[PDB]
């Protein structure tokens, strides 16, 4: 079958905390980074809603060395 890195690897999510106003590190939202190939990249899919407190839904985009992408939903806990 056709298998990109995104087919091969299975990133898992975890909660991210951040203070209001502060954009957190999307890599922090991947629980099992050690399972993924060297130099795997992490980005937010969308601008995190960090201007006020709340449980903000976000998505970590995992971009593998072959250019394929996985998406991992997480909650950003934004607190003052
Ligand atoms: Cu195959
Ligand atoms: Cu608070
Ligand atoms: Na995957």
CSV table of N, CA, C and O and ligand atoms in Angstrom, one decimal:
chain,number,residue,atom,x,y,z
A,1,UNK,N,0.9,-1.2,0.0
A,1,UNK,CA,0.0,0.0,0.0
A,1,UNK,C,0.9,1.2,0.0
A,1,UNK,O,2.1,1.2,0.3
A,2,UNK,N,0.3,2.4,-0.3
A,2,UNK,CA,1.0,3.6,-0.3
A,2,UNK,C,1.0,4.1,1.2
A,2,UNK,O,0.0,4.3,1.8
A,3,UNK,N,2.2,4.4,1.7
A,3,UNK,CA,2.4,4.8,3.1
A,3,UNK,C,3.3,6.0,3.2
A,3,UNK,O,4.6,5.8,3.0
A,4,UNK,N,2.8,7.1,3.6
A,4,UNK,CA,3.6,8.3,3.9
A,4,UNK,C,4.0,8.1,5.3
A,4,UNK,O,3.5,7.3,6.1
A,5,UNK,N,4.8,9.1,5.8
A,5,UNK,CA,5.2,9.1,7.2
A,5,UNK,C,3.9,9.3,8.1
A,5,UNK,O,3.8,8.7,9.1
A,6,UNK,N,3.0,10.1,7.5
A,6,UNK,CA,1.7,10.3,8.3
A,6,UNK,C,0.9,9.0,8.4
A,6,UNK,O,0.1,8.9,9.4
A,7,UNK,N,1.1,8.1,7.5
A,7,UNK,CA,0.4,6.8,7.6
A,7,UNK,C,1.2,5.9,8.6
A,7,UNK,O,0.5,5.1,9.4
A,8,UNK,N,2.5,6.1,8.7
A,8,UNK,CA,3.3,5.2,9.5
A,8,UNK,C,3.3,5.5,11.0
A,8,UNK,O,3.3,4.6,11.8
A,9,UNK,N,3.3,6.8,11.3
A,9,UNK,CA,3.4,7.3,12.7
A,9,UNK,C,2.1,7.7,13.2
A,9,UNK,O,1.2,8.2,12.5
A,10,UNK,N,2.0,7.6,14.6
A,10,UNK,CA,0.7,7.9,15.3
A,10,UNK,C,1.0,8.9,16.5
A,10,UNK,O,1.2,8.4,17.6
A,11,UNK,N,1.1,10.2,16.2
A,11,UNK,CA,1.2,11.1,17.3
A,11,UNK,C,0.0,11.1,18.1
A,11,UNK,O,-1.2,11.0,17.6
A,12,UNK,N,0.2,11.3,19.5
A,12,UNK,CA,-0.9,11.4,20.4
A,12,UNK,C,-0.9,12.8,21.1
A,12,UNK,O,0.2,13.3,21.3
A,13,UNK,N,-2.1,13.3,21.4
A,13,UNK,CA,-2.2,14.6,22.0
A,13,UNK,C,-2.1,14.6,23.5
A,13,UNK,O,-2.4,13.6,24.2
A,14,UNK,N,-1.9,15.8,24.0
A,14,UNK,CA,-2.0,16.1,25.4
A,14,UNK,C,-2.4,17.6,25.6
A,14,UNK,O,-2.1,18.4,24.7
A,15,UNK,N,-3.0,18.0,26.7
A,15,UNK,CA,-3.3,19.3,27.0
A,15,UNK,C,-2.1,20.2,27.0
A,15,UNK,O,-1.0,19.8,27.3
A,16,UNK,N,-2.3,21.5,26.6
A,16,UNK,CA,-1.4,22.5,26.7
A,16,UNK,C,-1.9,23.6,27.6
A,16,UNK,O,-3.1,24.0,27.5
A,17,UNK,N,-1.1,24.2,28.5
A,17,UNK,CA,-1.4,25.3,29.3
A,17,UNK,C,-0.7,26.6,28.8
A,17,UNK,O,0.4,26.5,28.3
A,18,UNK,N,-1.4,27.7,28.9
A,18,UNK,CA,-0.7,29.0,28.5
A,18,UNK,C,-1.4,30.1,29.3
A,18,UNK,O,-2.6,30.0,29.7
A,19,UNK,N,-0.6,31.1,29.6
A,19,UNK,CA,-1.2,32.3,30.2
A,19,UNK,C,-1.8,33.2,29.1
A,19,UNK,O,-1.4,33.2,28.0
A,20,UNK,N,-2.9,33.9,29.5
A,20,UNK,CA,-3.6,34.8,28.6
A,20,UNK,C,-2.6,35.6,27.8
A,20,UNK,O,-1.7,36.3,28.4
A,21,UNK,N,-2.7,35.7,26.5
A,21,UNK,CA,-1.9,36.5,25.6
A,21,UNK,C,-0.7,35.8,25.0
A,21,UNK,O,-0.1,36.3,24.1
A,22,UNK,N,-0.3,34.6,25.6
A,22,UNK,CA,0.9,34.0,25.3
A,22,UNK,C,0.6,32.8,24.4
A,22,UNK,O,-0.2,31.9,24.8
A,23,UNK,N,1.2,32.8,23.2
A,23,UNK,CA,1.1,31.6,22.3
A,23,UNK,C,2.0,30.5,22.8
A,23,UNK,O,3.2,30.7,22.9
A,24,UNK,N,1.4,29.3,23.1
A,24,UNK,CA,2.2,28.2,23.6
A,24,UNK,C,2.8,27.4,22.5
A,24,UNK,O,2.5,27.6,21.3
A,25,UNK,N,3.8,26.6,22.8
A,25,UNK,CA,4.6,25.8,21.9
A,25,UNK,C,3.7,24.6,21.5
A,25,UNK,O,3.4,23.8,22.3
A,26,UNK,N,3.4,24.5,20.2
A,26,UNK,CA,2.6,23.3,19.7
A,26,UNK,C,3.2,22.0,19.9
A,26,UNK,O,2.5,21.0,20.1
A,27,UNK,N,4.5,21.9,19.9
A,27,UNK,CA,5.2,20.7,20.3
A,27,UNK,C,4.8,20.2,21.6
A,27,UNK,O,4.8,18.9,21.8
A,28,UNK,N,4.4,21.0,22.6
A,28,UNK,CA,4.0,20.6,23.9
A,28,UNK,C,2.7,19.9,23.9
A,28,UNK,O,2.4,19.2,24.8
A,29,UNK,N,2.0,20.0,22.8
A,29,UNK,CA,0.7,19.3,22.7
A,29,UNK,C,0.8,17.8,22.1
A,29,UNK,O,-0.2,17.1,22.0
A,30,UNK,N,2.0,17.4,21.8
A,30,UNK,CA,2.3,16.0,21.4
A,30,UNK,C,3.0,15.3,22.5
A,30,UNK,O,4.1,15.6,23.0
A,31,UNK,N,2.3,14.3,23.0
A,31,UNK,CA,2.7,13.5,24.1
A,31,UNK,C,3.9,12.6,23.8
A,31,UNK,O,4.7,12.4,24.7
A,32,UNK,N,4.0,12.1,22.6
A,32,UNK,CA,4.9,11.0,22.3
A,32,UNK,C,5.9,11.4,21.2
A,32,UNK,O,6.1,10.7,20.2
A,33,UNK,N,6.5,12.6,21.3
A,33,UNK,CA,7.4,13.1,20.3
A,33,UNK,C,8.6,12.2,20.0
A,33,UNK,O,9.1,12.1,18.9
A,34,UNK,N,9.0,11.4,21.0
A,34,UNK,CA,10.1,10.5,20.9
A,34,UNK,C,9.9,9.4,19.9
A,34,UNK,O,10.8,8.8,19.4
A,35,UNK,N,8.6,9.1,19.5
A,35,UNK,CA,8.3,8.1,18.6
A,35,UNK,C,8.4,8.5,17.1
A,35,UNK,O,8.5,7.6,16.3
A,36,UNK,N,8.5,9.8,16.9
A,36,UNK,CA,8.5,10.4,15.6
A,36,UNK,C,9.9,10.6,15.0
A,36,UNK,O,10.8,10.8,15.8
A,37,UNK,N,10.0,10.6,13.7
A,37,UNK,CA,11.3,10.8,13.1
A,37,UNK,C,12.0,12.1,13.5
A,37,UNK,O,11.4,13.1,13.8
A,38,UNK,N,13.4,12.1,13.5
A,38,UNK,CA,14.2,13.3,13.8
A,38,UNK,C,13.7,14.5,13.0
A,38,UNK,O,13.5,14.3,11.8
A,39,UNK,N,13.6,15.6,13.6
A,39,UNK,CA,13.3,16.9,12.9
A,39,UNK,C,11.8,16.9,12.4
A,39,UNK,O,11.5,17.8,11.5
A,40,UNK,N,10.9,16.0,12.8
A,40,UNK,CA,9.5,16.2,12.7
A,40,UNK,C,9.2,17.7,13.2
A,40,UNK,O,9.8,18.1,14.2
A,41,UNK,N,8.3,18.3,12.5
A,41,UNK,CA,7.9,19.7,12.8
A,41,UNK,C,6.5,19.8,13.4
A,41,UNK,O,5.6,19.0,13.1
A,42,UNK,N,6.3,20.8,14.2
A,42,UNK,CA,5.0,21.1,14.9
A,42,UNK,C,4.6,22.5,14.6
A,42,UNK,O,5.4,23.4,14.7
A,43,UNK,N,3.3,22.7,14.3
A,43,UNK,CA,2.7,24.0,14.1
A,43,UNK,C,1.2,24.0,14.6
A,43,UNK,O,0.6,22.9,14.7
A,44,UNK,N,0.7,25.1,14.9
A,44,UNK,CA,-0.7,25.3,15.1
A,44,UNK,C,-1.4,25.4,13.8
A,44,UNK,O,-1.0,26.1,12.9
A,45,UNK,N,-2.6,24.7,13.6
A,45,UNK,CA,-3.4,24.7,12.4
A,45,UNK,C,-3.9,26.1,12.1
A,45,UNK,O,-4.0,26.6,11.0
A,46,UNK,N,-4.4,26.7,13.2
A,46,UNK,CA,-5.0,28.0,13.2
A,46,UNK,C,-4.4,28.8,14.4
A,46,UNK,O,-3.9,28.3,15.4
A,47,UNK,N,-4.6,30.2,14.3
A,47,UNK,CA,-4.2,31.1,15.3
A,47,UNK,C,-4.9,30.7,16.6
A,47,UNK,O,-6.1,30.8,16.7
A,48,UNK,N,-4.2,30.3,17.7
A,48,UNK,CA,-4.8,30.0,18.9
A,48,UNK,C,-5.6,31.2,19.5
A,48,UNK,O,-5.0,32.3,19.5
A,49,UNK,N,-6.7,30.9,20.0
A,49,UNK,CA,-7.6,31.9,20.7
A,49,UNK,C,-7.1,32.2,22.1
A,49,UNK,O,-7.6,31.8,23.0
A,50,UNK,N,-6.0,33.0,22.2
A,50,UNK,CA,-5.4,33.2,23.5
A,50,UNK,C,-5.6,34.5,24.1
A,50,UNK,O,-5.0,34.8,25.2
A,51,UNK,N,-6.5,35.3,23.6
A,51,UNK,CA,-6.7,36.7,24.1
A,51,UNK,C,-7.5,36.7,25.4
A,51,UNK,O,-7.5,37.8,26.1
A,52,UNK,N,-8.3,35.7,25.7
A,52,UNK,CA,-9.1,35.6,26.9
A,52,UNK,C,-9.0,34.2,27.5
A,52,UNK,O,-8.6,33.2,26.8
A,53,UNK,N,-9.3,34.0,28.7
A,53,UNK,CA,-9.4,32.7,29.3
A,53,UNK,C,-10.4,31.8,28.7
A,53,UNK,O,-11.4,32.2,28.2
A,54,UNK,N,-10.1,30.5,28.8
A,54,UNK,CA,-11.1,29.4,28.4
A,54,UNK,C,-10.3,28.2,28.0
A,54,UNK,O,-9.1,28.1,27.9
A,55,UNK,N,-11.1,27.1,27.7
A,55,UNK,CA,-10.6,25.9,27.1
A,55,UNK,C,-10.7,26.0,25.6
A,55,UNK,O,-11.8,25.9,25.1
A,56,UNK,N,-9.6,26.3,24.9
A,56,UNK,CA,-9.7,26.7,23.5
A,56,UNK,C,-9.3,25.4,22.7
A,56,UNK,O,-8.3,24.8,22.9
A,57,UNK,N,-10.2,25.0,21.8
A,57,UNK,CA,-9.9,23.8,21.0
A,57,UNK,C,-8.8,24.3,20.0
A,57,UNK,O,-8.9,25.4,19.4
A,58,UNK,N,-7.8,23.4,19.7
A,58,UNK,CA,-6.8,23.7,18.8
A,58,UNK,C,-6.3,22.4,18.1
A,58,UNK,O,-6.7,21.3,18.5
A,59,UNK,N,-5.5,22.5,17.1
A,59,UNK,CA,-5.0,21.4,16.4
A,59,UNK,C,-3.5,21.5,16.1
A,59,UNK,O,-3.1,22.5,15.5
A,60,UNK,N,-2.7,20.6,16.6
A,60,UNK,CA,-1.3,20.5,16.3
A,60,UNK,C,-1.2,19.8,14.9
A,60,UNK,O,-1.6,18.7,14.7
A,61,UNK,N,-0.5,20.5,14.0
A,61,UNK,CA,-0.1,19.9,12.7
A,61,UNK,C,1.3,19.4,12.9
A,61,UNK,O,2.2,20.1,13.3
A,62,UNK,N,1.4,18.1,12.6
A,62,UNK,CA,2.7,17.4,12.6
A,62,UNK,C,3.1,17.2,11.2
A,62,UNK,O,2.5,16.5,10.4
A,63,UNK,N,4.2,17.8,10.8
A,63,UNK,CA,4.8,17.8,9.5
A,63,UNK,C,6.0,16.9,9.5
A,63,UNK,O,7.0,17.3,10.1
A,64,UNK,N,5.9,15.8,8.8
A,64,UNK,CA,7.0,14.8,8.8
A,64,UNK,C,8.1,15.2,7.8
A,64,UNK,O,7.8,16.0,6.9
A,65,UNK,N,9.3,14.6,7.8
A,65,UNK,CA,10.3,14.9,6.8
A,65,UNK,C,9.9,14.7,5.4
A,65,UNK,O,10.5,15.3,4.5
A,66,UNK,N,8.9,13.8,5.1
A,66,UNK,CA,8.5,13.5,3.7
A,66,UNK,C,7.5,14.5,3.3
A,66,UNK,O,7.0,14.4,2.2
A,67,UNK,N,7.1,15.5,4.1
A,67,UNK,CA,6.1,16.5,3.8
A,67,UNK,C,4.7,16.2,4.1
A,67,UNK,O,3.8,17.1,4.0
A,68,UNK,N,4.4,14.9,4.5
A,68,UNK,CA,3.1,14.5,4.9
A,68,UNK,C,2.8,15.1,6.2
A,68,UNK,O,3.6,15.4,7.0
A,69,UNK,N,1.5,15.3,6.5
A,69,UNK,CA,1.0,15.9,7.8
A,69,UNK,C,0.0,15.0,8.5
A,69,UNK,O,-0.9,14.4,7.9
A,70,UNK,N,0.1,15.0,9.8
A,70,UNK,CA,-0.9,14.5,10.7
A,70,UNK,C,-1.5,15.7,11.5
A,70,UNK,O,-0.9,16.8,11.6
A,71,UNK,N,-2.7,15.5,12.0
A,71,UNK,CA,-3.4,16.5,12.8
A,71,UNK,C,-3.8,15.9,14.1
A,71,UNK,O,-4.3,14.8,14.1
A,72,UNK,N,-3.5,16.7,15.2
A,72,UNK,CA,-3.8,16.1,16.5
A,72,UNK,C,-4.6,17.2,17.3
A,72,UNK,O,-4.1,18.2,17.7
A,73,UNK,N,-5.9,17.0,17.5
A,73,UNK,CA,-6.7,17.9,18.4
A,73,UNK,C,-6.2,17.9,19.8
A,73,UNK,O,-5.8,16.9,20.3
A,74,UNK,N,-6.2,19.1,20.4
A,74,UNK,CA,-5.8,19.3,21.8
A,74,UNK,C,-6.6,20.4,22.3
A,74,UNK,O,-7.2,21.2,21.6
A,75,UNK,N,-6.7,20.5,23.7
A,75,UNK,CA,-7.2,21.6,24.4
A,75,UNK,C,-6.1,22.5,24.9
A,75,UNK,O,-5.2,22.0,25.5
A,76,UNK,N,-6.2,23.8,24.6
A,76,UNK,CA,-5.3,24.8,25.2
A,76,UNK,C,-6.1,25.4,26.4
A,76,UNK,O,-7.1,26.1,26.2
A,77,UNK,N,-5.6,25.2,27.6
A,77,UNK,CA,-6.1,25.8,28.8
A,77,UNK,C,-5.5,27.2,28.9
A,77,UNK,O,-4.3,27.3,29.3
A,78,UNK,N,-6.3,28.3,28.7
A,78,UNK,CA,-5.8,29.6,28.8
A,78,UNK,C,-6.2,30.2,30.1
A,78,UNK,O,-7.5,30.2,30.4
A,79,UNK,N,-5.3,30.6,30.9
A,79,UNK,CA,-5.6,31.1,32.2
A,79,UNK,C,-4.8,32.4,32.5
A,79,UNK,O,-3.7,32.6,32.0
A,80,UNK,N,-5.5,33.3,33.2
A,80,UNK,CA,-4.8,34.6,33.6
A,80,UNK,C,-3.7,34.3,34.6
A,80,UNK,O,-3.8,33.3,35.3
B,1,LIG,CU1,2.8,-0.7,0.5
B,2,LIG,CU1,-8.1,31.9,35.9
B,3,LIG,NA1,-0.6,9.2,11.4
